[PDB]
Amino acid sequence: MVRIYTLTLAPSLDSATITPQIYPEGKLRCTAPVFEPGGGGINVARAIAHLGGSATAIFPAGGATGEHLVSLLADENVPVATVEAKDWTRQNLHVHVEASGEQYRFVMPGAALNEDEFRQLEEQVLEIESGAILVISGSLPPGVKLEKLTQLISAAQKQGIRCIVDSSGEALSAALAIGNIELVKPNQKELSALVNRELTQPDDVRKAAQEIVNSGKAKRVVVSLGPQGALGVDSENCIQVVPPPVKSQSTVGAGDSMVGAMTLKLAENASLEEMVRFGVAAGSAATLNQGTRLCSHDDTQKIYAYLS
Amino acid sequence: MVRIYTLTLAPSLDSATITPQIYPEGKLRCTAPVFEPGGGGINVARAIAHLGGSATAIFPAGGATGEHLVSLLADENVPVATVEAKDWTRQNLHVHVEASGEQYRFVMPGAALNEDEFRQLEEQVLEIESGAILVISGSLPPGVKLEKLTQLISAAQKQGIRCIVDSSGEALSAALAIGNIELVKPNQKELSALVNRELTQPDDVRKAAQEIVNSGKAKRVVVSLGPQGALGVDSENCIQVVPPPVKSQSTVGAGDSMVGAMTLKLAENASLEEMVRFGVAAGSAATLNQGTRLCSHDDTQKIYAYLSR
């Protein structure tokens, strides 16, 4: 099986804390936080480890927070390839409210990258051998021009690196600008922004996904639909996969779990149907767990057997 | 096509109001409320009218609020058959918050019913002709023992009335104890309570629905699954229908819209597939509208054509 790498230009060291109630104005006293790795490509690599594969996370790390992020990944046996950055690795906050069981997630931008740190990141990307898979996932941090992202993807593709993209906004449009992306996973809002129109008719999501494939921007578009599962589109096929009717506990990590699973199937040269089913299995398996926990192998396997 | 009736033991006159912000402790200044008909069977009858059918809503009404409830339905050209009750028709509250666009729904019990009044409602039901359809939908109000609900449904079936049930808790178990219910529509929570186990495995919902059909409790069970659509089960068939991937504006009225649609299909002697498809079409069409608005005919048709393509 081909090697798998992920790229996260905006990683984070996330804090998970607990407080008894939520209300404005006053000080909410929060428990000592539990630190967890954060960022699109980093979580894709973690999900892949859970599913029994291996993926190397490429990312910039800065300061004590960056060192702790790398430390956490080592304890999870997730291989990494890091670039030391000047700006310190930023922190997002996950707050669990005990009285209500609700969770609040505050997502701020990643640390800045200068031109030289991005150059070093691109250097690590181009050390990846031909045929191997690269998952570019997450937001675009300050300090990086959009064209630099497109140029990185072009350079990767020129030497046979197979690129998978999961992002949003201008970053997503830019990653698809040159085209020939192997797989892209917009959710519904992300798809709507990408094709720049509202998707209000029953057939709109399918047609918008097909329009992306037909343009040559992506060979495979998997539109993820939250509890409705996903719609996968090829030049030859359109497949909708709906999760089993089991209550979601928490949706955190659903997208990254789905992406890790589909990446593994892509690495196996699986059918589109098998890929999307395994993606829905993993994304929905992720929901079965409280808080930030990612998909487990056993839950994904069980849901996949049901979908099959 | 047969006549359709609905029964709502706990109707309400609902107030819908607007306020700029929501926070505790202080007085939230709310706009003069707009009043709307409330209650399971009442809303099923309203959805049926939106879909071009006709259904008579049977319910207790009391006091000035009850009079207004009745007046509102006449304005909507929904036929009613009412029993005057001693306890005044109760009110639920729907609050739209301007700053967030969020809606809050405070659902309180229906007015009390005494034994005489329930017997009067029973009398109305038994005036329904054989072969007609009766949809019993909504909560059980104070004053009514569960054994009386069982007796009403049993009495109604004795003379060829085809009963459809949508309820929850002990009222749903009581309504199904008789058996031979034409159709029951539990959502996932209601199904879990009905079979008294958590449904945590992928096939649990289907197996639970089949268990109800196989035991003889219901001829058809449609488990509605929110954005996932519905799973319909017969002695012969099992199907899941998922709605198209369109954004839900508001979920209020989804269940009652779905039940109204399935009831119309049942009246037409439709297949299980056609019935569940029309049900999901109507339920999901309801979601396309803001606030409490029920499914519209055109939106339901558009989704159904898609599901039928």
Place this chain on the structure above:
Amino acid sequence: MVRIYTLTLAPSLDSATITPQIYPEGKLRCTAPVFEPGGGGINVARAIAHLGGSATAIFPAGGATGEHLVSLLADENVPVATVEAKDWTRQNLHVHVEASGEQYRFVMPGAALNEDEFRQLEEQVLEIESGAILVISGSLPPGVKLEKLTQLISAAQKQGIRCIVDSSGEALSAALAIGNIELVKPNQKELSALVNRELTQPDDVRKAAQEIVNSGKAKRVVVSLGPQGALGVDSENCIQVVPPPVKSQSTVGAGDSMVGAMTLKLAENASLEEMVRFGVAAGSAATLNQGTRLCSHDDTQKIYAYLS
């Protein structure tokens, strides 16, 4: 001691209910409500009963909800004088959320009054003997022109009825338009709207209250200041009374409790200082109780002894 009456043109039959959590979109299942009398003058009369006095509540009542409102007051031994109205007595909602201990209060307008029902209400007001006290408190319902309120107050004053006013907005301005009001109790926001300017300097509240007295609109202005107590102003005196440093549990009914207490002191021809102190004692005593419960005699007495 002189007789005391209250007038409530917009009464309500309030529902108090409990639900385990609060969140939007879904159905919040609420317990069978406990019904309680509502409306400014009605609650002033209830507070007066708690403090050991007697006040007759004048108000319109309509439908089964109106009958239950009258029924509740009878069980509280609060004497009433009612006018049967066509429009049914409206309902406000008090929601207690079990998980957080928070309470949410949704206040909607009162029922409409037609010209003839208002005429009957005015008739009951003018049956009040000279020297007796009338507390006009609460919002103005639909169907009643502002001038009708001012004309009612004028007619009352012409036959020696001593008027106390607690209201807001255009209704408050109108009640003060003719002047010679015995006592008015705006809170800070209400004062600001009345004098039509923002009160941002340390001395502004005092000066605004004094400006009302000096204009002849009111003989006594007591500006209530929430946890800061109240500032009472006369032609000869300015007195600030601050409550004791005890935690407030719920603020519901604080204003009406204060008004009932000050009304009783006014009926006793008490000093301004004694009046304001007893008002703060009752308002703050009200806060000591959870939910909607009004001031108790024993708590008010205890706080009054402290203030003295």
Place this chain on the structure above:
Amino acid sequence: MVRIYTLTLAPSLDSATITPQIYPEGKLRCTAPVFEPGGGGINVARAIAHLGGSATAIFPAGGATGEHLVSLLADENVPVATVEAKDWTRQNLHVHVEASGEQYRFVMPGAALNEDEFRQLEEQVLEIESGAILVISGSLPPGVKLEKLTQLISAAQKQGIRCIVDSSGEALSAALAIGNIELVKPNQKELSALVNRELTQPDDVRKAAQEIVNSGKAKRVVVSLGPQGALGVDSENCIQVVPPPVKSQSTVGAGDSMVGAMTLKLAENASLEEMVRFGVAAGSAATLNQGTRLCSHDDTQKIYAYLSR
């Protein structure tokens, strides 16, 4: 006038961000944060600068966040004396919600301190000259036994350093076990915990404060009462000062502003009355500003002149 120092065992580099709405489950997109100095003693020193005085903030700083904390204070011309700590300076989060204008404050513990680092902080404190003032303010970080806080304050007093304490829980009890504290500023909750009883009667707060003075634990106790101002107690005097009736915009920084003000008055050997008046003036001036902004000189002066009229 004597030199003023502050000690913050649990400093922070706080992030202030903005988001349009607050709701659970979904990702809330927050703006790139503005960083601000955090911590009790640190904020006391900042308020002192706003009021025209000078105070040296002593604290542990670690990692890049600690470097930024130090850099921010230098930009504000607040003198510091720091100990480099192994554990990186922690971050609290202040979230402004645009739709409601509300602010949410998530307060997490400070970075850990080992025994060596605390001894280094102790060394800094004992370099303070006799007769100077030290304000110990804020929470106790992980890694520090309560007996070490008691020892530091005892050691500091042994050589004429005048200690002012603002803290909570066991750290406050520990800080007062020594006795002869120049000034303590509990709020109502902190006072209740300190004397270990609910303060439910009108005179309970005054009696509790007097009990602390009379036992010798503190020379002055100022119980701060939020919008009700403060009650100040001496062996000789007892006074309550209530702020003017002006609307509070935001309460963040009220306590630290009040402590900074009272500290400056203590340095000037002011009367209890003048000290508490200036304290309430500064605390209430702080409330006049949005978000985290501390008291300003002019607003504090205006309120103080009013209180002094």
